[PDB]
Amino acid sequence: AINIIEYNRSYKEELIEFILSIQKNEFNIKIDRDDQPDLENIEHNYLNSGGQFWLAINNHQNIVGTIGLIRLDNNMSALKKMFVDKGYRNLKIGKKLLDKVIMTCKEQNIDGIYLGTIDKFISAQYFYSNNGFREIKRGDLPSSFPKLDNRFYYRNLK
Ligand SMILES: [Ca+2]
Closest listed residue to residue 78, CA positions, set 57, 103, 44, 53: 53
Protein residues within 5 Å, CB atom, of ion ligand 1: 32, 34-35
What is the Å distance from ligand 1's center to 35 Cα?
5
- Asked whether 20 and 66 are in contact (CB, 8 A), the reply is no
Distance CA 132, CA 128 (A): 7
What is the Å distance from ligand 1's center to 131 Cα?
32
What is the Å distance from ligand 1's center to 110 Cα?
33
- Asked whether 93 and 63 are in contact (CB, 8 A), the reply is no
DSSP string, the chain: --EEEE--GGGHHHHHHHHHIIIIIIS--S--GGG-GGGG-HIIIIITTT-EEEEEE-TT--EEEEEEEEE-STTEEEEEEEEE-GGGTTTTHHHHHHHHHHHHHHHTT--EEEEEE-TT-HHHHHHHHHTT-EEE-GGGS-TTSPP---EEEEEE--
Give the domain extent around 17: 1-158
What is the Å distance from ligand 1's center to 33 Cα?
7
The sign of the torsion formed by the CA atoms of 136, 139, 145, 147 equals positive
What is the Å distance from ligand 1's center to 60 Cα?
32
What is the Å distance from ligand 1's center to 91 Cα?
33
| Residue 15: other Cβ atoms inside 10 A | 20
Q: What is the CATH number of the domain that holds 18?
A: 3.40.630.30
The structural domain count of the chain equals 1
What is the Å distance from ligand 1's center to 38 Cα?
14
Q: How many residues does the chain have?
A: 158
**Structure's resolution in angstroms:** 2.2
What is the Å distance from ligand 1's center to 36 Cα?
8
What is the Å distance from ligand 1's center to 94 Cα?
27
Contact residues for 101 (Cβ-Cβ < 8 A; gap 6+): 52, 54, 67, 69, 79, 113
What is the Å distance from ligand 1's center to 87 Cα?
27
